[PDB]
Design a binder for this molecule. Structure first.
Ligand SMILES: CCCCCCCCCCCCCCCCCC(=O)OC[C@H](COP(=O)([O-])OCC(O)COP(=O)([O-])OC[C@@H](COC(=O)CCCCCCCCCCCCCCCCC)OC(=O)CCCCCCCCCCCCCCCCC)OC(=O)CCCCCCCCCCCCCCCCC
Ligand SMILES: CCCCCCCCCCCCCCCCCC(=O)OC[C@H](COP(=O)([O-])OCC[N+](C)(C)C)OC(=O)CCCCCCCCCCCCCCCCC
Ligand SMILES: CCCCCCCCCCCCCCCCCC(=O)OC[C@H](COP(=O)([O-])OCC[N+](C)(C)C)OC(=O)CCCCCCCCCCCCCCCCC
Ligand SMILES: CCCCCCCCCCCCCCCCCC(=O)OC[C@H](COP(=O)(O)OCCN)OC(=O)CCCCCCCCCCCCCCCCC
Ligand SMILES: CCCCCCCCCCCCCCCCCC(=O)OC[C@H](COP(=O)(O)OCCN)OC(=O)CCCCCCCCCCCCCCCCC
Ligand SMILES: CCCCCCCCCCCCCCCCCC(=O)OC[C@H](COP(=O)(O)OCCN)OC(=O)CCCCCCCCCCCCCCCCC
Ligand SMILES: CCCCCCCCCCCCCCCCCC(=O)OC[C@H](COP(=O)(O)OCCN)OC(=O)CCCCCCCCCCCCCCCCC
Ligand SMILES: CCCCCCCCCCCCCCCCCC(=O)OC[C@H](COP(=O)(O)OCCN)OC(=O)CCCCCCCCCCCCCCCCC
Lengths: 114, 80, 105, 313, 347, 98, 70, 96, 42, 167, 110
């Protein structure tokens, strides 16, 4: 039959979000609030096209807005967010309920400064 | 109904307790004001991704951002 | 005979476990959901005699999604040719096919 | 490194089984107004070592067995299932943190009757076969109420995971919503392990045609199952406070509660006469099983009428 | 047996057959067969003698082997089609295994080797259930999978069933082995016309069930299990000899009787499809069935075998058996050939 | 197709030919029948897990329950045969030849 | 008197204390001074494999924070 | 007590699931780039291997459709070594 | 039609019932002391 | 070698089936079926069917083979056995030798020669086992299935108490 | 993989202690003794009642096997149907027990 049509390796290069899963889960609700629109354009395009080849540019915009989000956390609230994701990172199941005061400090610093 | 039940509670207390617990388990979920909240929680636990809708132009009851006031909320679950 | 009581009464006794494309718990799709949905929507209502010779390509795609005979045959072919070229020495694998390159994300 | 973890699990199991015999003989000594062993060691501490070295140098009894292969494979399966029940146990961290640890323990404890059945086959006697079939019928009878009591408790857990059963029991012990299931569970674990007042094998046994070495092997498999069922009951009903920065608090706490529960086994065999065989069959099928089905219906319908269906995760 | 328990068990047999009929899922077909066997085992063990336990054991082994072959056919259908609809099968190997499994449940030759033993060991009511009601479920499944049934396999099974059920009943003097080899031959007739026009399969099924229920009801009303005890019936009640005369002449395929109807419509529908040697061989083979039917009529109705003295006491007592639908079934099994285009109601 | 399906189908045919060729007993025939059931269980489980057809995950449990009830029925038949003849040999079950 | 059962109870309690303390110390030793990552569900395993890929040195328990982005 | 605590546990479960839902589009974009990276690698190495074979077309889809088919495990980890294969095909199942 | 093969077949009984064609004894030996010779019925 | 673990367990499964299907004795037949049940359960466990595997160990080997051994213990108490054993064993090793030197065989259907790791899915199922949720849907979806299975087991109880009575 | 190594280690230690317990007193000769039980020479009587309790276990174990997904079935969206069918399965287990009871099935091993 036909030849499957794959994008080249230059087409897939992007600046990755090179952080851990506990760093992602710690900043997750602020991410889902602040990175709403490109994430939802990407998942709408992903369930409508039903093909990752037709969604690469929306995926790059997701991978761009995520890095913008973590740049804006890093400029103003590096130390309280680090104190928070270390406490999330200790646990095996990565509980939120073990880490309420560090979350309260991070939420206070983010609500004030950002 | 009063002397038979005392007679069987004297003879066979295990089976009387068994039928009483089973009868409570049968009838009591229909008499409870909290049976609705179990359903309301189980249909509000997000296992899958809430796949967004294409904004056709006429949807006043679907939000555009999760923090928007319109849409289903879980105020009742935070409070109870 | 097939006394279709479930349609005469309109009750779903066992229509739900019948196919993979039916309503699943927590919307979990099967691995060949789209292939089976396309075969069913192709061959619906036209009877089996027309369905076996007019939806031949959709059913061949769905059987090939299920058993993956052509895919595993192709990978047998590629791995056999590659082992011949490695044994004759006429080819060497790149470092991303030996595990030396710090995978993508 | 993981082999170090397997060894530091399964060697202190054997040492605790060894000194359980000393604890048992001392505690049943003082409950019978006498002293336990205190001649051999300093207050008897060298008694299980002496008993082990005696039982491993005694003559093989040598029956001309019907099956030599099952005469070998019954103690192998007895010790193997005796040691593999311990690997999913969270205390506070389990060795093999499996998603279905409760059902795994129920399955591997259901498999433990083949040691009894094969050790009745391997002996040539008809009466040992009859006694082995009576013991198998007893154990498979009480496995039913193990399963249903276990399910009725796990409806308050949400899953089959053993480590979630600590998270379930943070605000209160799970004996407070489920004390009838707790007391029937305790008698059911007491009647699984052929323990008094359910030890009709002590009242001729099934495995008397083994050597004293393999007698010690069945004996230590039985006591490993006793300490295991008590630790599993402590995890299941009397679960303790878990601080993730000091695991030793949960380890001290479940160890103290499990020692008190194993001593409760020792204090129950020293107080009651044996049931007759049809009386423990009566106790199961006509006393525990109606209550177990009734409380199973109650524990199905109770998180629905209280809006307290526990989480899956 | 306790009558409440017997009613519950018969409702479970009927429920298993209905679950095979009305369901669209292969697992529910298999559940219906399992429930049907599980409930029919006590009906054979109603008298509690070692012949009935031997018959129930042989029946259990054959129907369980057929159930496992049926589930393997279902599983290969799931391999090669990914679905569970009870429709055509999507593999010739699965079609072969399901035709073999249904042939074992029908007791068609060369899997026929259980039917006279199991039929002989059990009473006449359970034998009636075995030879009528247990045919309804596998013939329904064969009616549903006929777009995938192999032609040569089902025709080999059909002619081999007809010939072995012909030669088996000749040597028999027991009535129940005669009815069992009658069953093998008539299932051969029913499955021969299955791929051509299965309405004639349903017609042969219904007319066979009417004739077999007539013969077992006559055998129950006379309490006869051998030829030589059937032969005393003229000295007890000659109307029963008349009814077994006309019904055994019916079952062999003599006109104007309605047992000529199924095989004549089968011969009629196999000549449309350019098979002429095969229905002729089938018809010529059915003369053996008619031969041992004629032997039973010679021993019962057309002659008078000598009876004993104790028949003089049974002269004085009326038959208090509930001969349920025996005149209705005997009328429907003899005088129905003037209503032969009634077969369109089965289409 | 897959390589493991060869082994599981061959396992079913091996236990089939064990069931279809009696040696001495009826209990060995019941064990062959339940080996057939076991191979059917493993094969159905591999297909249902491999396709991610989620609703058929309840199907092997129904298979195991029904055929274990079937096995209990067969064990009861063997017990009645053994009470009649002392043993469970199949050559004792030959009274229906005539 | 009665307090002589307590040496045997003490030895048995230490022998039951050893495996839980040992598996806690081994899980903290082999995971960078932390608890073992629990992966009961495939999403937990996907995040754990993602940690192992983003860590660079092929260990899921090497965390990379905001020092790894620009 | 179990009523209050299981209701609190359901609230914690919803918080963790919504943390997952907030993370899911980034993980989906990275997973899609991951699988397209691996398929492009297999295509390029199939091009540099399958030059000796007559009549072979590289990247030839076995399906007759132009729809994207979700790639098989052997279609991704076919040309890679056994450690990566085992880590991806029994990593979750054999994990403790 | 009696051949050489089917020559030893006698007809079955008239009520389909064949004839049936015990209990355990335990000698509890001396192994105070007392030898009991039981006869049990299950 | 380790990529063929499901194949190795399937070979042990077939070897156990030739072991007890050659029928040395019902005792050793039950032993071979218990070893086969464990290794086929391992086959199920290596595809992620953890709950179905524990259904095997709890129900099959825990109830049913216990009852088969319990009945073999009280209702029963060579050259052909070992010859048929090495017949089935050499035929199975001929099949494995063919499919490993050839990477393609066809006894009845065509079979691959690689490992069956290749046929998996590369995704994740989130916070649920798909097999566990499919079994959990036996109550909400499978209502008719539960009705007929409970009725079949109740009828099974009634049937066993009828036919095992002697009267 | 950790689980298979753990099973292998447990089986190996069990087999090691069995090998020691069988072959450590084989150093001890002690004799070649001849050594020629309640019953003398009677064959094993069958007891119907042990078989009845074995089949009762097997059928109630199958009903338990149907009951085992209840901690997961509690999480469903269709709770009325789930609660009805859960109570129906436990009630069918109780009906099976009551029929086992009243027809004297639980007698002399009650
Ligand atoms: C649709 C399919 C219907 C199939 C037939 C259903 C009924 C028969 C099957 C069930 C059964 O055994 O019932 C007993 C059965 C009697 O069978 P039996 O004991 O063998 O008959 C001997 C005498 O009845 C012995 O008499 P008795 O002294 O015991 O009592 C007298 C009794 C007293 O009657 C009553 O008490 C009746 C009042 C109650 C009736 C039920 C109400 C509910 O009278 C009768 O029953 C007279 C016989 C009735 C006719 C039997 C055959 C019916 C037709 C069968 C199908 C014919 C198809 C022809 C097609 C031709 C072309 C292919 O029927 C009855 O008792 C009532 C029959 C009602 C007929 C309804 C017709 C319309 C259906 C629509
Ligand atoms: C005796 C039977 C007792 C239980 C009766 C049914 C209980 C019930 O609520 O079932 C609803 C359930 C489920 O109803 P439901 O409303 O949840 O169905 C909507 C569709 N799904 C499954 C996707 C949610 O079953 C049915 O409606 C159909 C199957 C059973 C129908 C009745 C069978 C009676 C058999 C008599 C013989
Ligand atoms: C891990 C848990 C504990 C394991 C067991 C305890 C560890 C120690 C085990 C070894 C104990 C000593 C060896 C076995 C007993 C020997 C005693 C005996 O009867 O000896 C006479 C026997 C035979 O002596 P004999 O030849 O005079 O025979 C006497 C019997 N008649 C006369 C009737 C023929 O000697 C041996 O068996 C010697 C065995 C080796 C000695 C020890 C080797 C080194 C061990 C370190
Ligand atoms: C609808 C809810 C579900 C109901 C069904 C399920 C019950 C759940 C528990 C499972 C029980 C399983 C076993 C049930 C068997 C019942 C029959 C029985 O045991 O009868 C015998 C018994 C007398 O015993 P006997 O015959 O001497 O036998 C030797 C033992 N002594 O006879 C008796 O002891 C008499 C028993 C009948 C009278 C019991 C009355 C109890 C009343 C309690 C208060 C009201 C509760 C409301 C619901 C009532 C439902 C009946
Ligand atoms: C987590 C904790 C686990 C603990 C497990 C063990 C519990 C028990 C611990 C030991 C208890 C007390 C041991 C000492 C008992 C008495 C020994 C003794 O004094 O023996 C004297 C004996 C004869 O002396 P002799 O010189 O002949 O006499 C003339 C003297 N003027 O001379 C001899 O007998 C020779 C010397 C023998 C010494 C034996 C010591 C005991 C060994 C027990 C095995 C376990 C050891 C610990 C293992 C775990 C730690 C690694
Ligand atoms: C008479 C014979 C000889 C007798 C003595 C020796 C045998 C008896 C004692 C050992 C019994 C072995 C039982 C092995 C299977 C136990 C079930 C099991 O593995 O369950 C645990 C787990 C399921 O939990 P889950 O959390 O889902 O898995 C991790 C992914 N999240 O599953 C996993 O984690 C899956 C891990 C990979 C698959 C493991 C498969 C193990 C090998 C199969 C059994 C081999 C032995 C066969 C014979 C056994 C006895 C019948
Ligand atoms: C496409 C088709 C779909 C399905 C349509 C319907 C199919 C009908 C299939 C008929 C199957 C009949 C099975 C046997 C009878 C069923 C009832 C029963 O169990 O009767 C047995 C009962 C036992 O009484 P008992 O006292 O134990 O007798 C022996 C000891 N004295 O009582 C007796 O023994 C009483 C004696 C007389 C029994 C006569 C029963 C006649 C039944 C058939 C009626 C005619 C057929 C219906 C029309 C054609 C349908 C195909
Ligand atoms: C060609 C068709 C057959 C294919 C398989 C052939 C396997 C080899 C066996 C050939 C027959 C050997 C034999 O004696 O069979 C009869 C035997 C029962 O007889 P027995 O009492 O054991 O011995 C006395 C001799 N009649 O029967 C048995 O012992 C039954 C043993 C069956 C075990 C089958 C194992 C797998 C066989 C290979 C795969 C198929």
């Amino acid at each position: 039959p036909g030849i499957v049509e794959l994008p080249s390796l230059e087409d897939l290069k992007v600046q990755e979000v090179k952080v851990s899963s506990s760093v992602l889960k710690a900043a997750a609700h602020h991410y889902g609030a602040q990175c709403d629109k490109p994430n939802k354009e990407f998942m709408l395009c992903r369930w409508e096209e039903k093909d990752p080849r037709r969604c690469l540019e929306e995926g790059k915009l997701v991978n761009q807005c995520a890095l913008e989000f973590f740049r804006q956390i890093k400029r103003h609230c590096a130390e309280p967010f680090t104190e928070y994701w270390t406490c999330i990172d200790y646990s095996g199941l990565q509980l939120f309920r073990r880490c309420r005061k560090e979350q309260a400090q991070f939420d206070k610093c983010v609500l004030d400064k950002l | 109904v009063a002397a038979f039940l005392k007679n069987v509670w004297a003879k066979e207390p295990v089976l009387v307790a068994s039928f009483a617990i089973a009868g409570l388990a049968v009838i009591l979920p229909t008499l409870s004001p909290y049976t609705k909240y179990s359903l309301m929680i189980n249909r509000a636990t997000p296992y899958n991704y809430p796949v967004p809708l294409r904004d056709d132009g006429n949807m006043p009851d679907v939000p555009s951002h999760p923090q928007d006031p319109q849409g289903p909320s879980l105020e009742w679950l935070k409070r109870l | 005979p097939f006394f279709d009581v479930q349609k005469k009464l309109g009750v779903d006794l066992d229509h739900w476990m019948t196919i993979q494309s039916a309503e699943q718990p927590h919307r979990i799709p099967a691995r060949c959901h789209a292939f089976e949905k396309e075969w069913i929507e192709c061959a619906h209502g036209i009877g089996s005699i027309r369905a076996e010779k007019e939806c031949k390509i959709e059913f061949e795609d769905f059987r090939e999604c299920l058993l993956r005979q052509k895919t595993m045959k192709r990978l047998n072919a590629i791995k056999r040719q590659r082992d011949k070229l490695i044994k004759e020495g006429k080819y060497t694998p790149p470092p991303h096919h030996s595990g030396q390159e710090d995978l993508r994300p | 490194m993981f082999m170090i973890n397997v060894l530091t699990l399964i060697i202190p199991i054997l040492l605790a089984v060894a000194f359980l015999t000393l604890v048992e003989r001392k505690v049943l000594g003082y409950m019978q107004f006498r002293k336990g062993p205190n001649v051999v060691g300093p207050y008897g501490l060298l008694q299980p070592i002496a008993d082990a070295i005696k039982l491993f140098i005694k003559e093989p009894l040598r029956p001309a067995t019907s099956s030599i292969s099952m005469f070998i494979l019954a103690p192998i399966l007895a010790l193997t299932l005796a040691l593999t029940m311990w690997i999913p146990l969270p205390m506070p961290y389990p060795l093999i943190n499996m998603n279905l640890g409760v059902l795994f323990m129920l399955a591997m404890s259901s498999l433990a009757v083949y040691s009894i059945l094969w050790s009745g086959w391997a002996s040539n006697s008809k009466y040992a076969l009859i006694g082995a079939l009576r013991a198998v019928a007893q154990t498979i009878s009480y496995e039913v109420t193990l399963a249903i009591i276990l399910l009725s408790v796990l409806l308050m857990n949400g899953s089959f995971t053993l480590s979630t059963l600590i998270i379930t029991q943070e605000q209160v012990w799970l004996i407070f919503p489920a004390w009838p299931l707790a007391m029937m569970w305790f008698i059911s674990t007491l009647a699984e392990t052929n323990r008094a007042p359910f030890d009709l094998t002590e009242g001729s046994g099934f495995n008397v045609e083994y050597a004293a070495g393999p007698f010690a092997l069945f004996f230590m498999a039985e006591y490993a199952n006793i300490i295991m069922m008590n630790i599993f009951t402590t995890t299941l009903f009397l679960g303790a406070f878990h601080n993730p920065y000091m695991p030793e608090l949960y380890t001290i706490n479940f160890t103290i509660k499990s020692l008190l529960l194993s001593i409760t086994f020792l204090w129950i065999r020293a107080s009651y006469p044996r049931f007759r065989y049809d009386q423990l069959m009566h106790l199961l099928w006509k006393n525990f099983l109606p209550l177990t089905l009734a409380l199973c219906m109650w524990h199905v319908s109770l998180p629905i009428l209280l809006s307290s269906i526990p989480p899956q995760t | 047996m306790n009558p409440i328990i017997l009613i519950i068990i018969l409702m479970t047999v009927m429920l298993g057959t209905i679950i095979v009929m009305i369901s669209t899922h292969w697992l529910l077909i298999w559940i219906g067969f399992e429930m049907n066997m599980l409930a029919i085992i006590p009906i054979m063990m109603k008298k509690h003698n070692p012949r009935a336990t031997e018959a129930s054991t042989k029946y259990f082994l054959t129907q369980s082997t057929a159930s496992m072959l049926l589930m393997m056919a279902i599983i290969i259908n799931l391999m090669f089609s990914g679905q569970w609809t009870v429709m055509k099968l999507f593999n010739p190997m699965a079609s072969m295994l399901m035709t073999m499994a249904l042939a074992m449940k029908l007791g068609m030759a060369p899997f026929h080797f259980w039917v006279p033993e199991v039929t002989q060991g059990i009473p006449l009511s359970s034998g009636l259930i075995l030879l009528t009601w247990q045919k309804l479920a596998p013939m329904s499944v064969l009616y549903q999978i006929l777009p995938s049934i192999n032609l040569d396999l089902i025709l080999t099974l059909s002619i081999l069933s007809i010939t072995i059920g012909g030669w088996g009943g000749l040597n028999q003097t027991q009535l129940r082995k005669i009815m069992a080899y009658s069953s093998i031959a008539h299932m051969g007739w029913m499955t021969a016309v299955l791929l051509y026009n299965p309405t004639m399969t349903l017609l042969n099924l219904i007319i066979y069930i009417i004739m077999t229920s007539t013969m077992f009801t006559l055998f129950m009303a006379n309490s006869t299990t051998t030829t030589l005890s059937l032969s005393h019936t003229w000295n007890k009640a000659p109307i029963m000899t008349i009814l077994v005369l006309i019904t055994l002449l019916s079952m062999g395929g003599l006109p104007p009787l309605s047992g000529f109807m199924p095989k004549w419509m089968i011969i009629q529908e196999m000549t449309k499809n350019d098979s002429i040697i095969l229905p002729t061989l089938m018809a010529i083979t059915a003369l053996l069935n008619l031969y041992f039917y004629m032997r039973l009529t010679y021993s019962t109705a057309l002659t008078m075998f000598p009876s004993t003295n104790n028949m003089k006491m049974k002269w004085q007592f009326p038959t208090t058996k509930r001969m349920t639908l025996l005149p209705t079934m005997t009328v429907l099994s003899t005088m129905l050939l003037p209503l032969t285009p009634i077969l369109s109601i089965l289409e | 197709m897959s390589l493991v399906y060869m082994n599981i189908m061959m396992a079913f045919t091996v236990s089939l030919t064990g069931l279809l060729m009696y040696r001495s007993h009826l209990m060995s025939s019941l064990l062959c029948l339940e080996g057939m059931m076991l191979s059917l269980f493993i094969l159905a489980t591999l297909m249902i897990l491999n396709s991610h057809f989620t609703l058929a995950s309840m199907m092997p449990i129904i298979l195991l329950v029904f055929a274990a009830c079937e096995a209990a029925l067969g064990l009861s038949l063997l017990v009645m045969v053994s009470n009649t003849y002392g043993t469970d040999y199949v050559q004792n079950l030959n009274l229906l030849q005539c | 008197m009665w307090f002589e059962v307590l040496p045997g109870i003490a030895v048995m309690g230490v022998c039951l204390f050893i495996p839980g303390m040992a598996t806690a110390r081994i899980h903290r030793f082999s995971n960078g001074g932390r608890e073992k990552r629990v992966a009961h569900y495939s999403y937990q395993w996907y995040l754990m494999e993602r940690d192992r890929r983003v860590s660079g040195v092929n260990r899921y328990y090497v965390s990379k924070g905001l020092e790894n982005i620009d | 007590s179990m009523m209050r605590w299981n209701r609190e546990r359901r609230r914690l479960q919803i918080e963790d699931f919504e943390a997952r839902i907030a993370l899911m589009p980034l993980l989906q974009a990275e997973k899609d780039r991951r699988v397209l990276q691996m398929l492009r690698e297999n295509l390029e190495e199939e091009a540099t291997i399958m030059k000796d074979v007559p009549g072979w077309k590289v990247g030839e889809s076995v399906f007759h459709t132009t729809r994207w088919v979700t790639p098989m495990m052997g279609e991704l980890y076919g040309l890679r070594t056994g450690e990566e294969i085992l880590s991806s095909t029994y990593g979750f199942i054999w994990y403790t | 039609y009696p051949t050489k093969e089917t020559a030893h077949w006698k007809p079955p009984p008239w009520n389909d019932v064949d004839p049936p064609k015990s209990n355990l004894t335990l000698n509890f030996g001396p192994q105070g002391v007392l030898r009991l010779v039981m006869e049990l019925s299950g | 070698m380790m990529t063929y673990i499901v194949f190795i367990l399937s070979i042990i499964f077939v070897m156990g089936f030739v072991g007890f299907s050659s029928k040395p004795s019902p005792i050793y037949g039950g032993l071979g079926l218990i070893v086969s049940g464990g290794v086929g359960c391992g086959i199920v466990l290596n595809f992620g069917g953890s709950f179905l595997g524990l259904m095997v160990f709890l129900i099959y080997l825990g109830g049913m083979m216990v009852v088969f051994g319990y009945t073999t213990a009280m209702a029963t108490e060579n050259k052909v056995v070992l010859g048929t054993f090495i017949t089935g064993l050499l035929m199975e090793f001929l099949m494995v030798y063919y499919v490993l030197k050839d990477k393609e065989v066809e006894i009845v259907f065509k079979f691959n020669g690689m490992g069956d790791w290749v046929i998996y899915d590369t995704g994740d199922s989130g916070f649920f086992s798909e097999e566990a949720m499919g079994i959990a849907a036996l109550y909400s979806y499978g209502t008719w299935l539960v009705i007929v299975t409970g009725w079949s087991l109740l009828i099974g109880v009634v049937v066993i108490m009828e036919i095992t009575r002697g009267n | 993989m950790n689980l298979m190594i753990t099973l292998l280690t447990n089986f190996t230690l069990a087999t090691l202690l069995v090998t020691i317990a069988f072959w450590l007193p084989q150093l001890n000769v002690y004799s070649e003794k001849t050594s020629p039980d309640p019953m003398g020479s009677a064959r094993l009587p069958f007891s119907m009642k042990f078989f009845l309790v074995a089949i009762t276990f097997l059928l109630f174990d199958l009903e338990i096997a149907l009951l085992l997904p209840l901690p997961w079935a509690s999480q469903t969206t269709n709770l009325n149907t789930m609660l009805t069918m859960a109570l129906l399965l436990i009630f069918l287990l109780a009906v099976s027990l009551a029929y086992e009871w009243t027809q004297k099935g639980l007698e002399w091993t009650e």
